[PDB]
């Protein structure tokens, strides 16, 4: 029933912020935790994310983690600032450098233990917790570093129970520092252990939608994040809202998961938004799959669809929903492995998202994503084989050994991609 | 907290001080007797400029700074001067015999003599602060001072503070302005003792200020003054980020990540732009993209090489004033397509960018034109090596004949650490020309 969710370091942090702003006005939730909404379906499955405080107040589920207090601050101040548990705000003060080692082995260490006895305190008032939620980077140093340290630390102290992280990988086009490949590579080995799902979140495909579909001349952080939280509010309405699929973390992961360490998605949204002409659903189902509405710059037809999650939101016709699902699966059959009988699952809802009367939301396992992998493997291996920057990170204790490592690892899991990808 | 201590060493260092200070309390509008009315939190607070200020339970901003020198006529001017009422008398340390422009004097035989009273001071500001970030210190290479204490004082920081980082700010010997024979040597000497202790150094050649000031501001000869007014606007430059903040500020830490791919390898280039008179700025708006092609002027360059003759390891863009990423974006796309911006092989090649919207400021009575918009690019080039190789021929002609040497042999040094140096050095040229070179 119960999701804990988890936000770590600048990225982690602003983006679930946004996700708690977006999904507390589809829930019906007001700043201060007051539900103000207009129909049941918004309070069935408000427990799911929303502890219920005194006075039938909501509080989200949720923990905010940073090495340096920043970003917290004005999370603090924001408009849903209020509505956090004052408890769940641990920060330290240093910060992580955009530096892994010291996220994962030095600063991060010596603040691990006292998020894990505030992530206790709320799994034990779980009537039955079903899993964790991580929002973060893999590009900076406390959501890559420490949140990995946190997914360990917490595997270890819940074995039983799924692992989902909304993972923002790292571009040069949408850069802070040189050692982002070095920060992402060695967070991709962590999670291909110990996560179960991961929503891979491309910078350089939520900068190149906003550059080239919504025309926004000078993309910001913000706008990134309004087509990230759109996608976090799609793929979690299943288990925010009454449904038969997909309706909890571990049904998601037998339906998308065929094989363990195959767990990295690639979410997709629409219409893509910054209009009053609502869509058709013929219209939804097209641009739901098509790669301009990918998060993960990745061309699906490079590679093979092995699982796909279909989510609709708004008043349509499901007759005409499912007539147009098993359209695009007939027409472009090729693109989906045949040793995978039906793995096309379409859920619906009836609540659209806020400005919107119809969306559609999209989740594949393609074994086109070993192009992100081989990106950052490339850009990675540009800086290492002249061992340049790494005195960052040899000055926190790291060997040059453990770079190797998760180079070698991660070249695996792309091969493991191909390996599927001619079968 | 990210609280900053600066260490001025020498006539150099303190007088280029004295110029900071003065535009630092310009710049957050404090005045002279430390007062600045727009804070309302008195005797403390965690503020951006409370880096480099502390606050006293009166209502003074007292800098966060320590002024040493080994004879006390230039820091007998700060105790007398505009801003005395700036400083505890305490962090204004004085000796009676200088150097006598002898790197074994500033080291050994005067230095320490006073390194136990520097350090007990600057212990004084450490304990006032509650999280400590590094140390800037400021220093010329030719002075005996500047050289030899400053070389005794960050070996001694390297142990009081661990890796703590260290910043420097080194003035680098011009002949138009030099007063010594030996700043070669004393030159070698210091950067190879300071090299393992230093995690950042920014290299300002007075030749090159110099020749901006009689170039750009038509200032016949220009005077140390001239000169230290132009650097601090540089300085503040750097500093800003630290001292302000702002949605798109980007801390000097994380343009430091990008400038040093091997500790060695810690010495940016910094070019500055508008460098004008206010005649000529008179109805002459220059935009985001001039300021910007000129950071790609050489002659606007803080050291004197040719970076079109190297290759880049990091390009950063600083700007303060009237900046948004649109124009800065704009700019920087004309500049790859007309300008020769060669990066080495291993390096991405997009230039980081940081943009502070306090704008810049002027002292009264100053040769610049008050600007809307200023930039100060720090870029890690193969190019600056070209400084090493000149003070390295200069060094290698009279050590050949060892002149001078007896000085230095007369306070207690041995030829050994001078070919030891020097080696040091040669490896430093030879570390510049590898990186530079293209993977196999
Ligand atoms: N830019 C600039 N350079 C200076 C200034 N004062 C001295 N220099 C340079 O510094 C070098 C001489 O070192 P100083 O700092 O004057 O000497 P010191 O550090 O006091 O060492 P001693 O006097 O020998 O004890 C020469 O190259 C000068 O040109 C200054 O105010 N501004
Ligand atoms: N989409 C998005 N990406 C961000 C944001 N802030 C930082 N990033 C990305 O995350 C990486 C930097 O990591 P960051 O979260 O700032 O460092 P951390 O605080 O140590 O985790 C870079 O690849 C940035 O492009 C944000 O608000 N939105
Ligand atoms: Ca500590
Ligand atoms: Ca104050
Ligand atoms: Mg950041
Ligand atoms: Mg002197």
Redesign the interface.
């Known amino acids: 029933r119960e999701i804990v969710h988890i936000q770590a370091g600048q990225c982690g942090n602003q983006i679930g912020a946004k996700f708690w702003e977006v999904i507390s006005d589809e829930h019906g939730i007001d700043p201060t935790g007051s539900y103000h909404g207009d129909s049941d379906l918004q309070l069935e499955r408000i427990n799911v994310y929303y502890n219920e405080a005194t006075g039938n107040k909501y509080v989200p589920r949720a923990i905010l983690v940073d090495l340096e207090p920043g970003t917290m601050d004005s999370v603090r101040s924001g408009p849903f600032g209020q509505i956090f548990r004052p408890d769940n705000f641990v920060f330290g003060?240093?910060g992580a450098?955009?530096?892994w080692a010291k996220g994962h082995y030095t600063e991060g260490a010596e603040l691990v233990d006292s998020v894990l006895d505030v992530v206790r305190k709320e799994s034990e008032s779980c009537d039955c917790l079903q899993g964790f939620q991580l929002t973060h980077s893999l590009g900076g140093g406390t959501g890559s570093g420490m949140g990995t340290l946190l997914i360990s630390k917490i595997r270890e102290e819940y074995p039983d129970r799924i692992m989902n992280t909304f993972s923002v990988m790292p571009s040069?086009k949408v850069?802070?520092?040189?050692?982002e490949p070095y920060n992402a590579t060695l967070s991709v080995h962590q999670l291909v252990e110990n996560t179960d799902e991961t929503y891979c979140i491309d910078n350089e495909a939520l900068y190149d939608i906003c550059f080239r579909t919504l025309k926004l001349?000078?993309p910001?952080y913000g706008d990134l994040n309004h087509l990230v939280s759109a996608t976090m509010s799609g793929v979690t309405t299943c288990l925010r809202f009454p449904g038969q699929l997909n309706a909890d973390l571990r049904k998601l992961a037998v339906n998308m998961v065929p094989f363990p360490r195959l767990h990295f998605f690639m979410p997709g949204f629409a219409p893509l938004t910054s209009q009053y002409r609502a869509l058709t659903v013929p219209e939804l189902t097209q641009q739901m799959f098509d790669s301009k509405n990918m998060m993960a710059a990745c061309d699906p037809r490079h590679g093979r669809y092995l699982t796909v999650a279909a989510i609709f939101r708004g008043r349509m016709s499901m007759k005409e929903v499912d007539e147009q699902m098993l359209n695009v699966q007939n027409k472009n059959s090729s693109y989906f492995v045949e040793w995978i009988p039906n793995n096309v699952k379409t859920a619906v809802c009836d609540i659209p998202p806020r400005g919107l009367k119809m969306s559609a939301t999209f989740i594949g396992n393609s074994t086109a994503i070993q192009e992100l992998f081989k990106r950052i493997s490339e850009?990675f291996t540009?800086?290492f084989?002249?061992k340049?920057?790494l005195?960052?990170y040899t000055?926190e204790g790291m060997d040059e050994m453990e770079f190797t490592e998760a180079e070698s690892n991660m070249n695996d899991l792309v091969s493991e991609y191909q390996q599927y990808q001619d079968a | 907290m990210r609280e900053c201590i600066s260490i001025h060493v020498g006539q150099a260092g303190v007088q280029i001080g004295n110029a900071c200070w003065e535009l630092y309390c310009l710049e957050h509008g404090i005045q002279p007797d430390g007062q600045m009315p727009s804070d309302k939190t008195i005797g403390g607070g965690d503020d951006s400029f409370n880096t480099f200020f502390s606050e006293t339970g009166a209502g003074k901003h007292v800098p966060r700074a320590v002024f040493v020198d080994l004879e006390p006529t230039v820091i007998d001017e700060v105790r007398t001067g505009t801003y005395r009422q700036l400083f505890h008398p305490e962090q204004l340390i004085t000796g009676k015999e200088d150097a006598a422009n002898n790197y074994a004097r500033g080291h050994y035989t005067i230095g320490k003599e006073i390194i136990d009273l520097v350090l007990d001071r600057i212990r004084k500001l450490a304990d006032q602060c509650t999280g400590l970030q590094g140390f800037l210190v400021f220093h010329s290479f030719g002075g005996g001072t500047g050289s030899g204490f400053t070389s005794l004082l960050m070996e001694r920081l390297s142990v009081d503070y661990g890796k703590k980082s260290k910043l420097e700010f080194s003035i680098y010997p011009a002949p138009q302005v030099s007063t010594a024979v030996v700043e070669p040597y004393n030159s070698i000497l210091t950067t190879h003792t300071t090299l393992e202790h230093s995690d950042c150094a920014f290299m300002v050649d007075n030749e090159a200020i110099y020749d901006i000031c009689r170039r750009n501001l038509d200032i016949e000869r220009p005077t140390y003054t001239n000169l230290n007014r132009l650097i601090s606007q540089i300085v503040s430059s750097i500093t800003a980020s630290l001292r302000f903040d702002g949605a798109l500020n980007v801390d000097l830490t994380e343009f430091q990540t990008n400038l040093v791919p091997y500790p060695r390898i810690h010495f940016p280039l910094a070019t500055y732009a508008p460098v004008i008179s206010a005649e000529k700025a008179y109805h002459e708006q220059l935009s985001v993209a001039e300021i910007t092609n000129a950071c790609f002027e050489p002659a606007n360059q803080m050291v004197k090489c040719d970076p079109r003759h190297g290759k880049y390891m990091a390009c950063c863009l600083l700007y303060r004033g009237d900046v948004v990423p649109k124009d800065v974006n704009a700019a920087i796309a004309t500049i790859k397509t007309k300008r020769s911006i060669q990066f080495v092989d291993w390096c991405p090649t997009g230039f980081k960018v940081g943009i502070n919207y306090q704008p810049p400021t002027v002292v009264p009575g100053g040769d610049l034109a008050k600007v809307q918009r200023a930039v100060c690019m720090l870029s890690n080039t193969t190019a600056i090596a070209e400084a090493w190789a000149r003070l390295d021929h200069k060094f290698d002609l009279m050590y050949a004949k060892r002149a001078f040497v007896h000085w230095y042999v007369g306070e207690g040094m041995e030829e050994g650490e001078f070919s030891e140096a020097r080696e040091d050095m040669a490896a430093l040229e030879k570390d510049y020309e590898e990186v530079g070179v293209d993977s196999v």
């Open positions: 003060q240093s450098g955009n530096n040069p850069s802070d520092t040189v050692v001349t000078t910001t850009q540009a800086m084989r002249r340049a920057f005195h960052w000055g």
